Design a protein around this ligand. Sequence first.
Ligand SMILES: [Mg+2]
Ligand SMILES: [Mg+2]
Ligand SMILES: [Mg+2]
Ligand SMILES: [Mg+2]
Ligand SMILES: [Mg+2]
Ligand SMILES: [Mg+2]
Ligand SMILES: [Mg+2]
Ligand SMILES: [Mg+2]
Ligand SMILES: [Mg+2]
Ligand SMILES: [Mg+2]
Ligand SMILES: [Mg+2]
Ligand SMILES: [Mg+2]
Ligand SMILES: [Mg+2]
Ligand SMILES: [Mg+2]
Ligand SMILES: [Mg+2]
Ligand SMILES: [Mg+2]
Ligand SMILES: [Mg+2]
Ligand SMILES: [Mg+2]
Lengths: 153, 117, 70, 66
Amino acid sequence: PRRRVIGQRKILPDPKFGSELLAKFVNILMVDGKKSTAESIVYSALETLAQRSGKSELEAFEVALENVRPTVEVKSRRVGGSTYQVPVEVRPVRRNALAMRWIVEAARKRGDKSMALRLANELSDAAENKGTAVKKREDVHRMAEANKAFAHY
Amino acid sequence: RKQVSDGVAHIHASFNNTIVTITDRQGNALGWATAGGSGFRGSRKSTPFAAQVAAERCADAVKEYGIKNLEVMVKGPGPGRESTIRALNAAGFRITNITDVTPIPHXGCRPPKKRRV
Amino acid sequence: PVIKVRENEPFDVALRRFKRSCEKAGVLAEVRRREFYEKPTTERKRAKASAVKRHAKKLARENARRTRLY
Amino acid sequence: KFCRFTAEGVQEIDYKDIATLKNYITESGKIVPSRITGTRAKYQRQLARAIKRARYLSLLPYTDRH
RNA sequence: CUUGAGUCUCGUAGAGGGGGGUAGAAUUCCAGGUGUAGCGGUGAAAUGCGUAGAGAUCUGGAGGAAUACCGGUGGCGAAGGCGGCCCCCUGGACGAAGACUGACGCUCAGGUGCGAAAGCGUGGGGAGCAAACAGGAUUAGAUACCCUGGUAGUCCACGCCGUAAACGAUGUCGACUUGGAGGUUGUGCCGGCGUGGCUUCCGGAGCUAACGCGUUAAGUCGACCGCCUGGGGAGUACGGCCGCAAGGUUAAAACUCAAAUGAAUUGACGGGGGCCCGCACAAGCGGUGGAGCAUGUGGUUUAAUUCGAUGCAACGCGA
Ligand SMILES: [Mg+2]
Ligand SMILES: [Mg+2]
Ligand SMILES: [Mg+2]
Ligand SMILES: [Mg+2]
Ligand SMILES: [Mg+2]
Ligand SMILES: [Mg+2]
Ligand SMILES: [Mg+2]
Ligand SMILES: [Mg+2]
Ligand SMILES: [Mg+2]
Ligand SMILES: [Mg+2]
Ligand SMILES: [Mg+2]
Ligand SMILES: [Mg+2]
Ligand SMILES: [Mg+2]
Ligand SMILES: [Mg+2]
Ligand SMILES: [Mg+2]
Ligand SMILES: [Mg+2]
Ligand SMILES: [Mg+2]
Ligand SMILES: [Mg+2]
């Protein structure tokens, strides 16, 4: 906004693991204020993911996140009728936010039956650079690299 | 083939492009690269970054000559004047002299008419 | 703007020296000036307007130093 | 400032005095504006004439890129 | 007679003019060397150029035009104009001491001369630039603006043309009338104090419709000249004179309107400027636009489909 009085809202950590990051993930998954439903989906997917990976719930989640977090993105800027995709650094909170949003979006277009299974499959795939979330991260990075010249805008 | 170890980097920095030619001290070209030939067209061609990539590529094109020392002649007002020299330095060349050789008439011929945009 | 890199001089320092030599010799201003033909009437108009604005600004500054803003 | 030629009582500038004239040209060989050296206008004109004469005789360069 | 006007003596600054020569930078072209896949251009492109080797870079050559810096609300000239350096010929201005002539002055219809750029004639020259022209774009179109090329012309000699917002939109000459800050160019005396010429800015009285002008007047006066008399028709037609032509110059009428105009004021507006704000963008989340159905409207239909609301601010609105 023009004035800038805008500051983090307090986020309660998820009950099972005490992770604020996981609570944000639940919020991103939630539809229509149905937080308990989203929590159940996330916990089921995390349990499946830990069984498949042997790591842990939180560690497997972090490993999936690291492969989807972007480092650079483009912001449009119109100059002479043409718009200049100017590559900018992505600050850490936005990296996490974009990664979780992309993971949820990718899991929602999967073909598996339950959303918990789709989410576990997406997290597993991202743990080894395979899912469409990792593909979106790669596309964002390549679009930013193609515009590396226009870094002063 | 022939080893030179002492060369000149000519940076033709125009508003639309940057040509980097590396010559021996007698003016014979050894290799060249341009911002326009380094995967940059249109708007991206005339940027300091495209000029930097052209400088890197021209430095690569003369690796076989074993050049170690570079005089730098800069010509033109383009955005690639400085970044080209920085990239030639980061390529490992010992830059021993930088000269501006931009042609200035001492009056000379009448320039083209002013654009009306 | 001929520049010779002195011994034990870091590259960035000598590049700055060359840049300052060029900015002092006015090469880029001369190049930009000579891109297109400007009619003598336009040149005289520009010079006259620049002198007039310089004088008016100087007088405004001198007479504002006698002015309290608050 | 300190226009030297009035304080030296010169009648001319002497194009053959390359020492003096080198103090009125930049490192690229350009004549220095009198608003920088503080030369008086009359002697600035004499100085420009002398420098041009010296350049013709190749006692001074026109530029630093001959 | 000497105070206006002029002559002489000594110096001073100056892109004043005419003629000739010459220098360095750069562009283009030509020849060759190195080298290799692009160059160039734009908002983005494309035309264009390039493997028949361009562009870049080096060497040598040819040719034309203009003189960076100095350079300056600096200088010179009646105005138009005038800019590297050197010589030849030449005009004016100014200052200091005097000496000399003795009103020889001012203005000027007609006349005569000069007079930017473009244009015209003859003969040269032609690098760069560029009306015309061609192509590529843009666009609804684009006979344009942008791009790639490009001929007259721009340059020289001689002749013509005689016009420009040829402007300070301010005729010439003389006198007088508070100040301040500069620039430039002389000169006197001891960096200070004077005293002349030209010139930039501000401003006082006064003047002015106002804007402004203000010792360089648009103030206060005198001499003489030019010119105006509502807007349009029209600086046109016809006639004359001039011109090779293009056209110039002198210059109406019928008819028509009740205005046209200047300066300033308050708004509004601007693809003017500055500073701010709003779920206005941006960042997001969920929708509408597709389906069925509800509901209102338009329309069509009807005997009647009652009346009203009907850009935002009517359309689940009066109901
Ligand atoms: Mg151009
Ligand atoms: Mg007459
Ligand atoms: Mg002409
Ligand atoms: Mg002719
Ligand atoms: Mg030609
Ligand atoms: Mg053109
Ligand atoms: Mg007239
Ligand atoms: Mg004029
Ligand atoms: Mg004028
Ligand atoms: Mg007039
Ligand atoms: Mg005034
Ligand atoms: Mg007529
Ligand atoms: Mg938005
Ligand atoms: Mg619908
Ligand atoms: Mg109704
Ligand atoms: Mg109605
Ligand atoms: Mg009504
Ligand atoms: Mg409602």
